[PDB]
Structures are given as structure tokens and as C-alpha cells.
A paper describes a structure:
Given the auxotrophic nature of pneumococci for certain amino acids, the Ami ABC transporter system, orchestrating oligopeptide uptake, becomes indispensable in host compartments lacking amino acids. The system comprises five exposed Oligopeptide Binding Proteins (OBPs) and four proteins building the ABC transporter channel. Crucially, SBPs determine the specificity of their respective transport systems, thereby governing the range of molecules capable of entering the cell. The five lipoproteins exhibit pairwise sequence identity of ~52–60% and share a very similar overall folding.
Consequently, the 1.8 Å-resolution open conformation of AliD was selected as a representative structure to describe the global architecture of OBPs in the Ami system. The obtained electron density map of the AliD structure, encompassing residues 28 to 652, presents an excellent quality all over the sequence. AliD adopts a bilobate structure characterized by three domains interconnected by short polypeptide chain segments serving as hinges. The two lobes enclose a deep cavity measuring ~16 Å in width and 45 Å in height, housing the peptide-binding pocket. Lobe 1 comprises Domain I (residues 29–63, 191–296, and 583–617) and Domain II (residues 64–190), while Lobe 2 consists solely Domain III (residues 297–582). The most striking feature of the AliD structure compared to OppA is the presence of an intriguing additional C-terminal 30-aa long α-helix (α19, spanning residues 622–652). This α-helix, which serves as distinctive hallmark of all the Ali proteins, establishes numerous hydrophobic and polar interactions with Domains I and II from Lobe 1, contributing significantly to the structural stability of the protein. The exposed surface of α19 is decorated with multiple basic residues, a conserved feature across all the OBPs in the Ami system that, besides its clear structural role, could help in proper orientation of the OBP on the membrane during oligopeptide binding. The ligand-bound and unbound forms of AliD retained the three-dimensional structures of the individual domains unaltered, as both conformations were related by a rigid-body rotation of ~20° of Lobe 1 (Domain III) relative to Lobe 2 (Domains I and III). AliD structure was solved by SAD technique.
Author numbering: 29 to 652
């Protein structure tokens, strides 16, 4: 049945409130249920969704969108509720800001007048830069140019909501009940039963129903156990797709029976990295026992040669092999914060341009290759030479060796313990345990969140280094680089740093240089090739200074599938461009072969690079 997608869901959905929530387990559902202004085609271009047309002013400050006449709201049973109107986009922003949406930073500094609204005693919302010119016309006025603004509209904080429905539901809006939202997307939510089932049905009156091929989507809850049985459901025809997991027991027969069908998904939008804490104050989780050890570690992590030595000794493949497969460990490798083909810079990839700038920082970077799916960094001799320089500098400063580094893990993630033990093993093998000792702090999930992700302030980060990630949310290198800026970077805290109190240490680390590189790049909003080259300078600075050490992406997982490759909508950012968007997806009767996938990927790489060209000039025609 090529009209029924049957699979599983393994996360715990918590809310359908697409305006206030941006958690992946929730957006994977509501992207099928609610449309925004734009969506993505299968090549990554922004294309019409609820908006059939759009324009931008010459100064880049005013975006206007024309809603299509048959954009409609439906209740979950499929009955028409009301046409979508431009005021619904005003309602959405006011509601998202008044209730402090998880995604508010996407718009707070972007829409004109919004930051003042969130701080006036009675700041009137009619001063905010979102307006319904008439029923079919929504107009956004921005506080500064944002060449990436349209890509933001694929995030659900920018989706519309009908005010009368919103007001009538009140506290019952956007729960886990299908009737707690209205539907404007390709599907209706026919069922949601917590920890058992999600079912979508194609909306036959959706404006783009003729483009929707999958009529039924059935997802069964997968609780993480008994991995050996979803392949059996693939063979029987009960499932359209089946993951192939190293943590399983039937692997042998699976890999070999499906050796010519196992395909790997594209690397997705989460950039994982290791980072240092260079301003540690919290020592509730340490194997160090003396003030002198803590002083030695604090001085070491401030030494750039020391951080680079760790960087060159961190074997990313061995870490990836523990969580994923050792065969497929290389599929997820990532060497930059900004994925190396995230944008093109003229004839070159972003990663090629970053490499050209990075070589200027030192002979240790000569020949560096930052491409995906290989480890750019690991190099024993480079690590040992860097450490020897660091040890001379640090000994001269009064430090005692070996340097002990604490890293915390959630002990309930088996991939996390085995992964960090691999990092300990490799670092100590390469640099020597008379030089460095990695002390893994196994913690409960609650304690692990308290030392890092949920640490109340920068001063509460309780580790010397950590493994962490960033999800990009708009189509510009700054989405990955801005969080680490020294004026107001949201993620300065992961380094233990606060912009005001640690201004001196921030300057001494060179982060003012990084921050000025980002400002200079953001200034370029007419020539994107020049804009992106300037962001490459900042990415190269970050790599050289090794406060962040890029490691891997998400995605890149093995499966057998009946999904015809490269037909679904696709994007690097937003929620309309991942494997959870069934609208453009097509199913086939026969299992995809590795050979078919290779030919489809080459065809897609040709057509995508070309269509992105035709799409840009296309956007030059929308400048009004
Ligand atoms: Mg039900």
C-alpha cells in the first residue's frame, strides 16, 4: 500500500501548541497539521505555502505576503472552520510573545517594535511590525535587514492562529487532544493516543491536496526495547521503513539479507561539538581533590596550545562508533559548527572557504579538509607536538601535570557512557596519562541536566568540558555562530562566561575578535557571497581557538525503506524540510536498493544545485 506510511515514533510528544513550543517530538507532528507562509520543495528552496506570493522592500525592512484564497482552517474532523486571514498572523505573534514562546528569540530582536513591546508598561501591540493590511495581506516590518527572514517563516512560531478559536479554547488550546488546534496543513490528526499511536489522514480539501500522495500515516509507539522486531514488521509489510540498529540482536541476518538495501539518511541540522569550560566555578562533580589541581586545570584550559592538543587527539570516529555503528561511524562526522555545504560561497562550499581561511592561522592547519563524513582533526603527531608546547608554557606558569579534566555524562544513556569512555581512552593514549587524565562523572539524568543544559547560571556549569549541540533555525551561517558571540551570545554560558562580569577574560580569549568578525559579516546584506565569506572567517577563528571542537551531526542513520528517495520536502532549517513531512513524500512497492539511492542522490545533487540557482534570481524578482 503505497498510499499508507506505517512506522514508529519513539519520543514523547508533550503539546500541539505550535506557537509556544519548539521541541522536535512536537514539531514532527504539527508540521503535517499546520501550514505557515512558506514551505520547502524537495531541493531545499522556499516555495509557496499559505502565501501564494511575497515581496520585500528595497531596504530589506518590509516583507509582505499574499495569502491564497483557499487557505482554510479545519477542525480535526475535516469540517471547514474558517478561511485563514492575515489577522491570524498578528494573533500568532502577540500570543507567542505574551506567553514567552520557547522560540521567541527567533523574532524578539527581528520584528520592529517587538523588543519594546516585551518591556513597555502598556506597550501597545499596534506599534509592533506585524500587520494585517487586508484579509489576504500580511506585512512584517523588521528592526534590521535579515536576508534569511523568509526561512524563519518555516518555524512554527511564525504560523497563524485563529483568534476566536484561540480565545474559545483558552487554557485548552494546543494540548495533546486533536481538537485542541485547528488544521491548515496537508493532514488531519485522526488519532493521538499517548505512548501508543499517532494517525494522520490526508485532508481532501487542503489547497494542495493534489500534491499529497500518502493518504494514511500510522505511527506506533516504540519504547526503545526489543529492537529485534521492527525488521520483522518490515518483511511482513506492516512497516514502510525499519531502522537498522547496532544495539540489536538479529543484526547479522538483517545486515546480510538487506546488504543491498541498507541506506543512510542525510546528515541533519544538529551540529554536535565538544566545548571547554574556561571559567569554572562549580566543583560539586570532580575527581580533583586539591585547590592546586583545580588551579592547574583552570590554567590549562585557558592555554590555546592545550585546547588544540586535545582537539587533535579527540578521535571523532571512535566516539561515533560507540553511539552508532563502527561501520557507519564516519557517516555522521562533522568538522564545523556551520555544516560545510550549508551555503555555497560562489563556486566553493562554505567548508572549502573556511579551510582556506583556517590555514592562515598556523602550519598545524595546512592541508586541513573540513568536508563532511570524515575526521578533519585527529592527528597523533600534531596533538603531541601541541601538547609539548603547552606543557612548557604551563609549567613555566606554575601548573602541575597531569591535567585532570572532568566531563559529565547521563549514566542512563548507554551510548553516552561508552562514548565518553572512548574519548578518555583515546586522549590518554595519544597525549599520555602522565600528561592528561579524563575523569568521567556519571550522573543521573536530573544531575546531568543540572550541571550543563539546565545549569541556572554560567557559574553553575560543573565540568571542564562537555558534549553539546546546536540546532540551526534560519538559513544563514549566523544561526550557528551568533550563539557564541561575546556581547550577548545565548550560549556564552557553556564556556562558563558571562558577558558583563567576564568582559576581561572574554577579551583575553580573543572572543572580541570573533564578535567583530560576525558583526562585519552581518553588515553585508546585498552580496551573499561576500556575507558568507566573512562568516567563514569567524568559523575559522572558532576552529583555531578550540573553545568549540566540532564532532558530528545527527542523521546519518541506517534503515531499509520503501520511501522513494529525495521526493519529500527538504531544508537545512525550520520544520518543513525533514523526514517527518509527508506532503511531498512518495512510497514505492519495492524496497529501495543502495544502487537506486546512489542514482537518486546524484540526480538530486544535480537538480538541487541548479534549482537553488534558479531560485535566487527568482527572489531578485520579489524585491519591491
Ligand atoms: Mg483517538
Amino acid at each position: 500500500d503505497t498510499k499508507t506510511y506505517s512506522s514508529t515514533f519513539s519520543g514523547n510528544p508533550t503539546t500541539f501548541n505550535y506557537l509556544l513550543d519548539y521541541y522536535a517530538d512536537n514539531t514532527a507532528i504539527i508540521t503535517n497539521l499546520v501550514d505557515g507562509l512558506l514551505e520547502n520543495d524537495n531541493h531545499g528552496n522556499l516555495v509557496p505555502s499559505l502565501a501564494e506570493d511575497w515581496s520585500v522592500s528595497s531596504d530589506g525592512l518590509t516583507y509582505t505576503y499574499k495569502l491564497r484564497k483557499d487557505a482554510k482552517w479545519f477542525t480535526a474532523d475535516g469540517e471547514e472552520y474558517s478561511p485563514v486571514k492575515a489577522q491570524d498572523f498578528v494573533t500568532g505573534i502577540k500570543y507567542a510573545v505574551d506567553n514567552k514562546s520557547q522560540a521567541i528569540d527567533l523574532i524578539q530582536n527581528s520584528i520592529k517594535g517587538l523588543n519594546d513591546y516585551i518591556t513597555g508598561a502598556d506597550s501597545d501591540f499596534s506599534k509592533v511590525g506585524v500587520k494585517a493590511i487586508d484579509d489576504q495581506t500580511v506585512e512584517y516590518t523588521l528592526a534590521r535587514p535579515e536576508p534569511y527572514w523568509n526561512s524563519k517563516t518555516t518555524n512554527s512560531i511564525l504560523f497563524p492562529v485563529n483568534e476566536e478559536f484561540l480565545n474559545s479554547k483558552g487554557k485548552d488550546f494546543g494540548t495533546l487532544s486533536p481538537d485542541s488546534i485547528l488544521y491548515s496543513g496537508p493532514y488531519l490528526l485522526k488519532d493521538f493516543t499517548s505512548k501508543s499511536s499517532i494517525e494522520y489522514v490526508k485532508n481532501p480539501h487542503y489547497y494542495d491536496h493534489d500534491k499529497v500522495s500518502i493518504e494514511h500515516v500510522k505511527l506506533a509507539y516504540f519504547d526503545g526495547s526489543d529492537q529485534e522486531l521492527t525488521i520483522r514488521n518490515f518483511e511482513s509489510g506492516a512497516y514502510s521503513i525499519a531502522g537498522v540498529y547496532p544495539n540489536s540482536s538479529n543484526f547479522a541476518k538483517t545486515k546480510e539479507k538487506y546488504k543491498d538495501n541498507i541506506v543512510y539518511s542525510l546528515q541533519d541540522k544538529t551540529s554536535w561539538y565538544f566545548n571547554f569550560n574556561v571559567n569554572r566555578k562549580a566543583y560539586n562533580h570532580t575527581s580533583k581533590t586539591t585547590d592546586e589541581q583545580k588551579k592547574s586545570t583552570e590554567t590549562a584550559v585557558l592555554n590555546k596550545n592545550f585546547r588544540q592538543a586535545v582537539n587533535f587527539a579527540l578521535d571523532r570516529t571512535a566516539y561515533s562508533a560507540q553511539s552508532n555503528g563502527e561501520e557507519a561511524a564516519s557517516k555522521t562526522l562533522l568538522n564545523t559548527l556551520v555544516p560545510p555545504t550549508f551555503v555555497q560561497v560562489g563556486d566553493k562550499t562554505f567548508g572549502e572557504v573556511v579551510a582556506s581561511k583556517l590555514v592562515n592561522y598556523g602550519t598545524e592547519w595546512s592541508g586541513i579538509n573540513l568536508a563532511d563524513a570524515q575526521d578533519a582533526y585527529f592527528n597523533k603527531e600534531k596533538a603531541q607536538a601541541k601538547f609539548a608546547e603547552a606543557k612548557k608554557e604551563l609549567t613555566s606558569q606554575g601548573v602541575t601535570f597531569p591535567i585532570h579534566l572532568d566531563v559529565a555524562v547521563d549514566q542512563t544513556s548507554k551510548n553516552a557512557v561508552t562514548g565518553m569512555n572512548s574519548v578518555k581512552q583515546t586522549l590518554e593514549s595519544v597525549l599520555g596519562s602522565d600528561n592528561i587524565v579524563i575523569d568521567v562523572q556519571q550522573l543521573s539524568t536530573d544531575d546531568f541536566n543540572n550541571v550543563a543544559f539546565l545549569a541556572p547560571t554560567a557559574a553553575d556549569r560543573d565540568y571542564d568540558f562537555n558534549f553539546d549541540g546546536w540546532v540551526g533555525d534560519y538559513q544563514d551561517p549566523s544561526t550557528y555562530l551568533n550563539p557564541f558571540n561575546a556581547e550577548d551570545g545565548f550560549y556564552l554560558k557553556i564556556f562558563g562566561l558571562d558577558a558583563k562580569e567576564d568582559k576581561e577574560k572574554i577579551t583575553s580569549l580573543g572572543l572580541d575578535t570573533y564578535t567583530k568578525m560576525l558583526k562585519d559579516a552581518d553588515r553585508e546584506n546585498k552580496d551573499v557571497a561576500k556575507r558568507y565569506e566573512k562568516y567563514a572567517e569567524a568559523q575559522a577563528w572558532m576552529i583555531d581557538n578550540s573553545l568549540i571542537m566540532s564532532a558530528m551531526s545527527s542523521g546519518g542513520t541506517a534503515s531499509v525503506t520503501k520511501v522513494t528517495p529525495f521526493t519529500r520536502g527538504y531544508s537545512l532549517v525550520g520544520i518543513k524540510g525533514d523526514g517527518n513531512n509527508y506532503k511531498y513524500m512518495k512510497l514505492q512497492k519495492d524496497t529501495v536498493t543502495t544502487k537506486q539511492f546512489e542514482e537518486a542522490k546524484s540526480k538530486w545533487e544535480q537538480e538541487s544545485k541548479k534549482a537553488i540557482e534558479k531560485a535566487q534570481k527568482e527572489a531578485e524578482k520579489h524585491v519591491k
